[PDB]
PDB file of C-alpha atoms and ligand atoms in Angstrom:
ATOM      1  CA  UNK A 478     133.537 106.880 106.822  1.00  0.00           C
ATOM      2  CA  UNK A 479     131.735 103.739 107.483  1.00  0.00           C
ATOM      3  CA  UNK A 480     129.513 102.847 109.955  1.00  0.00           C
ATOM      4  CA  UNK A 481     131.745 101.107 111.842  1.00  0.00           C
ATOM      5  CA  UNK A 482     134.117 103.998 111.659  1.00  0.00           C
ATOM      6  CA  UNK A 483     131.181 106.126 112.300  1.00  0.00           C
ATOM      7  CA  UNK A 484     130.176 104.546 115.754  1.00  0.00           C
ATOM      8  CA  UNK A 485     134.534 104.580 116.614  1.00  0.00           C
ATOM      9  CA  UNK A 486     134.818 108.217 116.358  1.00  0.00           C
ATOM     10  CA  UNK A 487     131.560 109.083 118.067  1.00  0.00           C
ATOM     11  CA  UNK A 488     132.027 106.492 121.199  1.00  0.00           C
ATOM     12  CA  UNK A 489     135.948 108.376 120.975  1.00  0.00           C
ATOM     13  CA  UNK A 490     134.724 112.069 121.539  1.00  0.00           C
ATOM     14  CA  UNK A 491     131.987 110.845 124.384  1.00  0.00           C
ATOM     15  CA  UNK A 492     135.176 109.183 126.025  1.00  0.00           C
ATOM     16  CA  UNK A 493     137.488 112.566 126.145  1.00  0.00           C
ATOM     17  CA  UNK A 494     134.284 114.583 126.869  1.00  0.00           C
ATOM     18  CA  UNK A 495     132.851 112.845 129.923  1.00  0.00           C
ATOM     19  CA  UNK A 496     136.311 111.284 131.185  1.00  0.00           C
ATOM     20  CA  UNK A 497     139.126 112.685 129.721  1.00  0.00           C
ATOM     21  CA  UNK A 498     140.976 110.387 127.637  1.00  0.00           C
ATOM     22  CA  UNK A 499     140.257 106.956 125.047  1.00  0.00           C
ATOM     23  CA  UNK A 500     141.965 103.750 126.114  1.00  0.00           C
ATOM     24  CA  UNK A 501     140.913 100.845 123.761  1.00  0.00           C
ATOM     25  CA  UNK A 502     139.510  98.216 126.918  1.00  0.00           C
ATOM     26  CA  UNK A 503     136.855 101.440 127.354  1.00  0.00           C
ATOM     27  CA  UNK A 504     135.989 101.569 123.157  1.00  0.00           C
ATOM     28  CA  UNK A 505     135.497  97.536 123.376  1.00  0.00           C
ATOM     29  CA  UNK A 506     133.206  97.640 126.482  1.00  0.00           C
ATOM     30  CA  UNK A 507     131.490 100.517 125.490  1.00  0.00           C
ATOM     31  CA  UNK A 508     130.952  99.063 121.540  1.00  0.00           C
ATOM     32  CA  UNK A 509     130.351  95.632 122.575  1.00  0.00           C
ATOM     33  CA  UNK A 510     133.462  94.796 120.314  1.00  0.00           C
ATOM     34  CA  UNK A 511     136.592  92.160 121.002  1.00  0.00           C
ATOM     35  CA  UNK A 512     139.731  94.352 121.814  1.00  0.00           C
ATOM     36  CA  UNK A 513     141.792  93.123 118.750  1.00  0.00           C
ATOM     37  CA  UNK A 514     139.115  94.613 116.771  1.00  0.00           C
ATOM     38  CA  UNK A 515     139.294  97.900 118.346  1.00  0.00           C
ATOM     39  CA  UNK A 516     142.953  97.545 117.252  1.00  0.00           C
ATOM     40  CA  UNK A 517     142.690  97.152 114.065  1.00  0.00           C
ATOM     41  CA  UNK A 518     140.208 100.106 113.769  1.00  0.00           C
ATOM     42  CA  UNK A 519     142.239 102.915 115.770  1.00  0.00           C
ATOM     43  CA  UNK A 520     145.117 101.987 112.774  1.00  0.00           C
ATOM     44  CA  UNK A 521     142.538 102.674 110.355  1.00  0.00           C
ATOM     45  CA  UNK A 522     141.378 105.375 111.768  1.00  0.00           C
ATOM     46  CA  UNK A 523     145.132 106.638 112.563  1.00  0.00           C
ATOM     47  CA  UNK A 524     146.008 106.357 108.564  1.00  0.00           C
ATOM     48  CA  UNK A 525     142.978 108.177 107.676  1.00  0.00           C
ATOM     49  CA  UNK A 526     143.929 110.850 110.495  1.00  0.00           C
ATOM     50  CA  UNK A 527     141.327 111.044 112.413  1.00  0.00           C
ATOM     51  CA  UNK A 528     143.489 110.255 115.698  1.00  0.00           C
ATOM     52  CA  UNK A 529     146.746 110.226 117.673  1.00  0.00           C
ATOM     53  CA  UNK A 530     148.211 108.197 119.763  1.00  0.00           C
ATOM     54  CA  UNK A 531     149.890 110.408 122.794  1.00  0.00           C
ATOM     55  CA  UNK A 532     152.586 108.431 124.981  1.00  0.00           C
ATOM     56  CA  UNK A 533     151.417 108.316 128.333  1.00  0.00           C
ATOM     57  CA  UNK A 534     147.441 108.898 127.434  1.00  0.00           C
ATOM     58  CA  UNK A 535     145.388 107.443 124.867  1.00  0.00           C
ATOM     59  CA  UNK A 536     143.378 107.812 121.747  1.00  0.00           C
ATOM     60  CA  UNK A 537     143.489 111.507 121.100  1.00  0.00           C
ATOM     61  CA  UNK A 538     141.096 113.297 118.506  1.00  0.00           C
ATOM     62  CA  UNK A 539     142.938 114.956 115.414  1.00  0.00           C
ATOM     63  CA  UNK A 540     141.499 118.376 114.269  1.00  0.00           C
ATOM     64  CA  UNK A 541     139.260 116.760 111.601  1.00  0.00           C
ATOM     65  CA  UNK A 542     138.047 113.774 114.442  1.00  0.00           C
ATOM     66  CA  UNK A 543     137.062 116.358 116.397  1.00  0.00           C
ATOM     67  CA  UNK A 544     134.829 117.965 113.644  1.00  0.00           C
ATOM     68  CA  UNK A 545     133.741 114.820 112.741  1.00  0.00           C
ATOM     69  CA  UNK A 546     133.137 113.171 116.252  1.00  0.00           C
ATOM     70  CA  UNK A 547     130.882 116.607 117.137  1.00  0.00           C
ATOM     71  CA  UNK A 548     128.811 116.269 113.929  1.00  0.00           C
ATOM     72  CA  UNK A 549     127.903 112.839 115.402  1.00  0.00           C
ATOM     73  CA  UNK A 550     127.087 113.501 118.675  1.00  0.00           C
ATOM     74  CA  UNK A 551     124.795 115.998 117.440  1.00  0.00           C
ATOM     75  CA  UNK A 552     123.242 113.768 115.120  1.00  0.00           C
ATOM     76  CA  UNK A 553     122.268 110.961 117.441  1.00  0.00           C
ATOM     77  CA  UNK A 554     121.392 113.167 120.225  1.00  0.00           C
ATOM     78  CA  UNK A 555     118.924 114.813 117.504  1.00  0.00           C
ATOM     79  CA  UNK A 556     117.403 111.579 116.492  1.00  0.00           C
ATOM     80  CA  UNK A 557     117.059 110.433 119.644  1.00  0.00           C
ATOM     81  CA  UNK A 558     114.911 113.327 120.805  1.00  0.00           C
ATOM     82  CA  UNK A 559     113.269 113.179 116.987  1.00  0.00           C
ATOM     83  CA  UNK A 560     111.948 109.661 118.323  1.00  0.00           C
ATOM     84  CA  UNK A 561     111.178 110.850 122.057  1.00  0.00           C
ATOM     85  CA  UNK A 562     109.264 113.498 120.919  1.00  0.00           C
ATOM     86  CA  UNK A 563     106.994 111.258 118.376  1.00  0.00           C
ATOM     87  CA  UNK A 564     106.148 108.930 120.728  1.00  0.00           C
ATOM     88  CA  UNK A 565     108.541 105.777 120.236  1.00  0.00           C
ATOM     89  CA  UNK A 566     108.755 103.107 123.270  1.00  0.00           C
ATOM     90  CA  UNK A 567     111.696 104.557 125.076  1.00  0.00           C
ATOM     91  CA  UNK A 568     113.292 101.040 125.057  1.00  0.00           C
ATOM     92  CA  UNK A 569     113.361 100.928 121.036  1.00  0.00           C
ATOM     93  CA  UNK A 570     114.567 104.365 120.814  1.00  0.00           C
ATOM     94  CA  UNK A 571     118.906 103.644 121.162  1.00  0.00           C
ATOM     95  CA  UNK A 572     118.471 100.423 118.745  1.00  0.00           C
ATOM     96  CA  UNK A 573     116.578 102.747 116.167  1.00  0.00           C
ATOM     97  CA  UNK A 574     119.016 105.907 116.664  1.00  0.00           C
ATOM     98  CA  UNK A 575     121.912 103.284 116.427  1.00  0.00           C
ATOM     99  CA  UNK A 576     120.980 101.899 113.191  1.00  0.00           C
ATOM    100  CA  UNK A 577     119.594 104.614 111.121  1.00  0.00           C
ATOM    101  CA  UNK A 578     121.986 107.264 111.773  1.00  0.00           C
ATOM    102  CA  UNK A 579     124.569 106.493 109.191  1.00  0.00           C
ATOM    103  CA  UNK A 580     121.560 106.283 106.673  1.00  0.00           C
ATOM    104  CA  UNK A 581     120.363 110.227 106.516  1.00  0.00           C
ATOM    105  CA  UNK A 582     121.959 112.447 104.330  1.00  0.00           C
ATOM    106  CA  UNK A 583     122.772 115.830 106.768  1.00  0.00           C
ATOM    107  CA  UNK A 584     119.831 117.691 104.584  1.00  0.00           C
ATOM    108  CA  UNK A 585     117.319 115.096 106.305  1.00  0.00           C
ATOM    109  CA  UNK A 586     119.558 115.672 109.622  1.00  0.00           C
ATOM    110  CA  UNK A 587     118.263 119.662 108.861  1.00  0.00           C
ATOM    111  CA  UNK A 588     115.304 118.615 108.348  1.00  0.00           C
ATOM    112  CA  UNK A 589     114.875 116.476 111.203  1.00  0.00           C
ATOM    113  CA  UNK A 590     116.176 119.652 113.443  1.00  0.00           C
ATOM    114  CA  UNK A 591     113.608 121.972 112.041  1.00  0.00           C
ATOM    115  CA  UNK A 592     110.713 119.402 113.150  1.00  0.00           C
ATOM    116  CA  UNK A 593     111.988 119.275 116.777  1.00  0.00           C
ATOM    117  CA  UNK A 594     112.178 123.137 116.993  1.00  0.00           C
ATOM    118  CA  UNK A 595     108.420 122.848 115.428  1.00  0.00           C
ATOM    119  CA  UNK A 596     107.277 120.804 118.742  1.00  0.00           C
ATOM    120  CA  UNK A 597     109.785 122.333 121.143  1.00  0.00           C
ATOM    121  CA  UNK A 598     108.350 125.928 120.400  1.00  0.00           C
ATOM    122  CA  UNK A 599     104.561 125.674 121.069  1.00  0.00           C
ATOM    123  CA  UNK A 600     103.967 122.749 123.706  1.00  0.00           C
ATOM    124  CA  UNK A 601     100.336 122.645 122.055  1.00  0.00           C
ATOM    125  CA  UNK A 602     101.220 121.256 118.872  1.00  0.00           C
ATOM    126  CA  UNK A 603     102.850 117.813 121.033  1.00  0.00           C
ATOM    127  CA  UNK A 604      99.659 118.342 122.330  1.00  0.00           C
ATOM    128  CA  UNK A 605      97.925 117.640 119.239  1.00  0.00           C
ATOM    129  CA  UNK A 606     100.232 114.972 117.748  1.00  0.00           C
ATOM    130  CA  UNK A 607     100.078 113.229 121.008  1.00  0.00           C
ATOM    131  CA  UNK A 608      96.197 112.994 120.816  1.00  0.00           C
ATOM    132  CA  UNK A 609      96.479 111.149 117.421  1.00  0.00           C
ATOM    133  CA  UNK A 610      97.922 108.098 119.184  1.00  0.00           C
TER     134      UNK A 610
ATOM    135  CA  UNK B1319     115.252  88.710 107.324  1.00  0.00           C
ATOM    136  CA  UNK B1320     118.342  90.764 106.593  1.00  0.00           C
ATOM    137  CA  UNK B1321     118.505  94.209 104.627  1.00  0.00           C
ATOM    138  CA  UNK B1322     119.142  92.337 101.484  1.00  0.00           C
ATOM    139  CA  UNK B1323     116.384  89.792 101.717  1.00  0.00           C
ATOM    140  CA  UNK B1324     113.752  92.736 102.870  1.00  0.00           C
ATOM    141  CA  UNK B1325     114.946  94.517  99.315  1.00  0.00           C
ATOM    142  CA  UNK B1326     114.519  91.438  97.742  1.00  0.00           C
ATOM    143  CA  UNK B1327     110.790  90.655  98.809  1.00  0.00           C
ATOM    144  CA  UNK B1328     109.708  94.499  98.535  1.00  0.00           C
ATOM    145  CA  UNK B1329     111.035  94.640  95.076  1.00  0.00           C
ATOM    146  CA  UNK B1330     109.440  91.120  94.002  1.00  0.00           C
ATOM    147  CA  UNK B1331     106.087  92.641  95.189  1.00  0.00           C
ATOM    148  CA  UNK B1332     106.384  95.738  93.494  1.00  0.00           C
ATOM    149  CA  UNK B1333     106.833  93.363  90.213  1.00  0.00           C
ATOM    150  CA  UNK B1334     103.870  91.133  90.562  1.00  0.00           C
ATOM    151  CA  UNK B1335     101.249  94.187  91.801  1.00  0.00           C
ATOM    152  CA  UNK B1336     102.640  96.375  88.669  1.00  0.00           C
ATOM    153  CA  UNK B1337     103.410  94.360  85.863  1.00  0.00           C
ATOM    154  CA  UNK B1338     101.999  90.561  86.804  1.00  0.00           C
ATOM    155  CA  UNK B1339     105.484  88.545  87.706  1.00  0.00           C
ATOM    156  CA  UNK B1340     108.694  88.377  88.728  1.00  0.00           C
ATOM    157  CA  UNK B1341     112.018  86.949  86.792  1.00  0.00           C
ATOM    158  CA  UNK B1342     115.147  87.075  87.832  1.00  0.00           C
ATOM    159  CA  UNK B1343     116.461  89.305  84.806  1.00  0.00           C
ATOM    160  CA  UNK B1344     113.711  92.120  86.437  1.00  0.00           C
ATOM    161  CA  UNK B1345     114.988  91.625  89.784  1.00  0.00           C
ATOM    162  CA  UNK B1346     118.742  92.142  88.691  1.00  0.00           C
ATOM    163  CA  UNK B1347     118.408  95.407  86.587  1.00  0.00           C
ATOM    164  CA  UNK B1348     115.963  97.078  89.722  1.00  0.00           C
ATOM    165  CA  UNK B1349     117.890  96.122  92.170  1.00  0.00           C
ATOM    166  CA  UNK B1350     121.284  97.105  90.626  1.00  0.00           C
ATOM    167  CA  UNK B1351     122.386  93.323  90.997  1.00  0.00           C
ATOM    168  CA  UNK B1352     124.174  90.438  89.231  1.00  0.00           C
ATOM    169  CA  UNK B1353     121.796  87.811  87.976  1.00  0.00           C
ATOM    170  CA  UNK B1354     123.656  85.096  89.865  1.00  0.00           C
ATOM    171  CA  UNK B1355     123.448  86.759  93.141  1.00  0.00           C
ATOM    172  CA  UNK B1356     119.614  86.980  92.646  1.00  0.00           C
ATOM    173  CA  UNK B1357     119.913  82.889  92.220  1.00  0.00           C
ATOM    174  CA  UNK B1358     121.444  82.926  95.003  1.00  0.00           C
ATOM    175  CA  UNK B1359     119.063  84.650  97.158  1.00  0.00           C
ATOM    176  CA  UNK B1360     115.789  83.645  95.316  1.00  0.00           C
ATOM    177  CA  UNK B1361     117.202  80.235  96.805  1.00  0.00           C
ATOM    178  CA  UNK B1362     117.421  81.417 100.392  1.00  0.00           C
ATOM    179  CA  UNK B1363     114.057  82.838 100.003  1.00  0.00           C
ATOM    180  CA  UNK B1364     112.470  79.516  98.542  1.00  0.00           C
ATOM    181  CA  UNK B1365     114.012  77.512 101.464  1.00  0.00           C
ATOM    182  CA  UNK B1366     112.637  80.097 103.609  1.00  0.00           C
ATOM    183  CA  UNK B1367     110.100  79.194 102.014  1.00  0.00           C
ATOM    184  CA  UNK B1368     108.940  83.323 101.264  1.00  0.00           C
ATOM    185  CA  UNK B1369     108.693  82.261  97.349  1.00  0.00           C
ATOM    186  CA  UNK B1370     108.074  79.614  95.054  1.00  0.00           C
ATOM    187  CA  UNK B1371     108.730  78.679  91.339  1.00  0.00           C
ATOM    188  CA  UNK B1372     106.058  78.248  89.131  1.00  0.00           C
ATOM    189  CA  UNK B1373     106.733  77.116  85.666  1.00  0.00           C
ATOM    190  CA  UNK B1374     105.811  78.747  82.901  1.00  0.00           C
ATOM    191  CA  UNK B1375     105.542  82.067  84.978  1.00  0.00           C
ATOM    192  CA  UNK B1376     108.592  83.262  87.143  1.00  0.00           C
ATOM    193  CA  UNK B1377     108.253  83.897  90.834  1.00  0.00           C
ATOM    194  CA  UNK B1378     105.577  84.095  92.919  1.00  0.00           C
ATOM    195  CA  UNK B1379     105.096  85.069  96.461  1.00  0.00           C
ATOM    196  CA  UNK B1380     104.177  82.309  98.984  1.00  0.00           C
ATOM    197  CA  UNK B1381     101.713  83.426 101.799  1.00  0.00           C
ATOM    198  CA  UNK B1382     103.994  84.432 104.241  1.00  0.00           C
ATOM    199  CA  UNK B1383     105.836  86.091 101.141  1.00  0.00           C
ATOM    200  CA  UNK B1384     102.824  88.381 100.316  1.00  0.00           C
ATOM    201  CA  UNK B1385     102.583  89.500 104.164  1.00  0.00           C
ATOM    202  CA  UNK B1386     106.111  90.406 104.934  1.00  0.00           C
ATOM    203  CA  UNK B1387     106.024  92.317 101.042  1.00  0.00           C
ATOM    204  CA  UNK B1388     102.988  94.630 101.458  1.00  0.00           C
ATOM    205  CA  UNK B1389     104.751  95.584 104.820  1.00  0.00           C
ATOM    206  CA  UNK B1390     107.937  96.543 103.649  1.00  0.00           C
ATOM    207  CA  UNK B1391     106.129  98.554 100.434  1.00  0.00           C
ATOM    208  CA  UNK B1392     103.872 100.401 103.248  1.00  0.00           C
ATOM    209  CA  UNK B1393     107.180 101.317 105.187  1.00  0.00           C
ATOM    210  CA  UNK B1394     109.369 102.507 102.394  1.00  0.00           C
ATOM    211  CA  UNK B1395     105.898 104.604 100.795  1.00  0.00           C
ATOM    212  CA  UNK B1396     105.479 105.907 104.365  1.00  0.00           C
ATOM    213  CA  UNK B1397     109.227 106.657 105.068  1.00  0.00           C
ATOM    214  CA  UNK B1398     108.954 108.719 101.318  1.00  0.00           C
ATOM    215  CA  UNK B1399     105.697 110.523 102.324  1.00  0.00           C
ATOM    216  CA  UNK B1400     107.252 111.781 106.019  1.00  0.00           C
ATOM    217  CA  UNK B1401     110.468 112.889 104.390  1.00  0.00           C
ATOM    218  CA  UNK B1402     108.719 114.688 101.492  1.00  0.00           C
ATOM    219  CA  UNK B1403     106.220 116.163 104.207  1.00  0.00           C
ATOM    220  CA  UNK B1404     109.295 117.790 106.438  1.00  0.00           C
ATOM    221  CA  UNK B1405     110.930 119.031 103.170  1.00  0.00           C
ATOM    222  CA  UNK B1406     114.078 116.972 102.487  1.00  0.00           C
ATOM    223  CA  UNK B1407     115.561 117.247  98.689  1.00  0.00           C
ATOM    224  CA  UNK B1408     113.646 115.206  95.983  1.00  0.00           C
ATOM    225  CA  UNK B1409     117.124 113.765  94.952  1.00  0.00           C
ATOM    226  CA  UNK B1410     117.845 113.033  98.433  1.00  0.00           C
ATOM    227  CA  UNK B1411     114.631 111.301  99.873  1.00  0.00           C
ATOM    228  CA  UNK B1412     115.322 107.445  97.917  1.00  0.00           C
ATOM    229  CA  UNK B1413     118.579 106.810  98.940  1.00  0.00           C
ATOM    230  CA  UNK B1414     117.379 108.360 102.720  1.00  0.00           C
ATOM    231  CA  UNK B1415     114.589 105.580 102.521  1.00  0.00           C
ATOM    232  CA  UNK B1416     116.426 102.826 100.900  1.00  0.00           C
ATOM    233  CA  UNK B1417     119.090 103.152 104.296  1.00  0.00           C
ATOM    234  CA  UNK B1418     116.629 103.845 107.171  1.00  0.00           C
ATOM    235  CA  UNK B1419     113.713 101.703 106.263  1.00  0.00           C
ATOM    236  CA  UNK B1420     115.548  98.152 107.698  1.00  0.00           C
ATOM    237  CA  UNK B1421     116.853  99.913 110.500  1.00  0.00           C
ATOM    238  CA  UNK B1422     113.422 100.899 112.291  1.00  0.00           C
ATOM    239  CA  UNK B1423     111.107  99.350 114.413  1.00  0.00           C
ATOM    240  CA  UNK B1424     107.492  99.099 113.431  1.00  0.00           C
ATOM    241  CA  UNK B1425     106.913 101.078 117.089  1.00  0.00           C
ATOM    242  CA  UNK B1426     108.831 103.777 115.001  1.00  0.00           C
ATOM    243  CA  UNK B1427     106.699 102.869 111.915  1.00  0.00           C
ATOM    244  CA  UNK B1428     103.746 103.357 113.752  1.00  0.00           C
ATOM    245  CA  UNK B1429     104.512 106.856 115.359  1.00  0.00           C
ATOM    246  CA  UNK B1430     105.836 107.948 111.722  1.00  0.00           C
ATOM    247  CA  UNK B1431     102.711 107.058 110.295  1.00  0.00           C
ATOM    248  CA  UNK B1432     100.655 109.072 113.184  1.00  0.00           C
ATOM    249  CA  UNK B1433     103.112 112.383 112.483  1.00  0.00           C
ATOM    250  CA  UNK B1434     102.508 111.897 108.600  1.00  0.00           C
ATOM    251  CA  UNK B1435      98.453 111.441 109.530  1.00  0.00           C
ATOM    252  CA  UNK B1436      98.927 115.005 111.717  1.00  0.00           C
ATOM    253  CA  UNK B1437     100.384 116.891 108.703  1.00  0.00           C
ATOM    254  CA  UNK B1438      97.556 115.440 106.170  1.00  0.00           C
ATOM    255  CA  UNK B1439      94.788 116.736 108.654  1.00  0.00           C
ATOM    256  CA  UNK B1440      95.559 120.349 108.993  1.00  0.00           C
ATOM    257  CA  UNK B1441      97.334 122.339 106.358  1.00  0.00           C
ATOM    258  CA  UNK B1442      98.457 124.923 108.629  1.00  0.00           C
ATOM    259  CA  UNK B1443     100.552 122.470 110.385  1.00  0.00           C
ATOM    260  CA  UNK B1444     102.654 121.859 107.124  1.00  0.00           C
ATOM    261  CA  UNK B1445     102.882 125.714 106.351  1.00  0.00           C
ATOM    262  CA  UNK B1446     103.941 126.474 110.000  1.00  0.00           C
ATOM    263  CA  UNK B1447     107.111 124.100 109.688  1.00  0.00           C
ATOM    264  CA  UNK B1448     107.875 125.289 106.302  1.00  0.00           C
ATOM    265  CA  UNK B1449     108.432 129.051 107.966  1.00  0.00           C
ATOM    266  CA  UNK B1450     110.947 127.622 110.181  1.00  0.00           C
ATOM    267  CA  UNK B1451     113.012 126.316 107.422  1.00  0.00           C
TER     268      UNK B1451
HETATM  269 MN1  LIG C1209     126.226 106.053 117.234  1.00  0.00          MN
HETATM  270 MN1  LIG C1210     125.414 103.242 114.797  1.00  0.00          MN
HETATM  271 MN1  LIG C1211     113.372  99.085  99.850  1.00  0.00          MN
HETATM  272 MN1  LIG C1212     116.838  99.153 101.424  1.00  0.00          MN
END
């Protein structure tokens, strides 16, 4: 996977999760992308299997773009409370999260889990952190 | 500046601080590039006017050039130092950097650098996150 494809599969699963379906008009509004685009990204994404199309519905997730779609959604939720709980502007913290998640191998991803469960277990150490800034 | 042209300007800096220049053959072999893509971006940056060509020497770093390098070697040697402090894999921690580093604000730069500051002032922080892992 790409970025690109990355960001298609991810925006797919929040779509099915919070609504119930994926049309393509709600994957270009929600990527900022032209609708032909979308197009020719659900094909590659339908030859690499990560989705169906059913009849009267839309984009569905195959079994490995559900696996795949969850993995992401974890990721840049974790990142995004990585970056809330250093300090970053809350305005900076989507652009950041949005960028650098296809860049971190899943051991930094780990890593990056193991630091939030460091500040989310004693409230003091935030605390401490916080009073560096 | 784009990804490429940050790579470029980091690694040019790295050249002149280390040995005492930069060619074009250097540049190719570091950055895992053909030597007439590097002409083609050592042009960019001229008319950008981030470098400039002196003679008998190779290139050198204009003013602006100097400021925007010693930036981007502080973020990629801070980026290193955080992931190395949280414990991601040796192997892992170059190719991490070499992804995330043009995809962060310096607001995320700065908090970064006051998390890595919190770990080098108190062992005991460092050993407590390690017993999570
Ligand atoms: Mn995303
Ligand atoms: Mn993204
Ligand atoms: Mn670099
Ligand atoms: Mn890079």
């Amino acid at each position: 996977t790409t970025p690109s494809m990355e960001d298609y599969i991810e925006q797919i699963y929040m779509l099915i999760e919070e609504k119930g379906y994926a049309r393509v008009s709600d994957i270009a509004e929600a990527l900022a992308v032209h609708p032909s685009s979308v197009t020719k990204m659900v094909q590659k994404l339908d030859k690499d299997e990560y989705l169906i199309y059913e009849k009267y519905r839309g984009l569905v997730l195959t079994s490995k773009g559900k696996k795949i779609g969850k993995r992401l959604v974890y990721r840049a939720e974790l990142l995004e409370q990585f970056l809330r709980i250093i300090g970053v502007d809350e305005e900076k913290i989507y652009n950041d999260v949005e960028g650098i998640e296809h860049h971190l191998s899943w051991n930094s991803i780990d890593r990056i889990g193991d630091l939030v469960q460091y500040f989310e277990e004693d409230d003091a150490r935030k605390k401490d952190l916080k009073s560096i800034q």
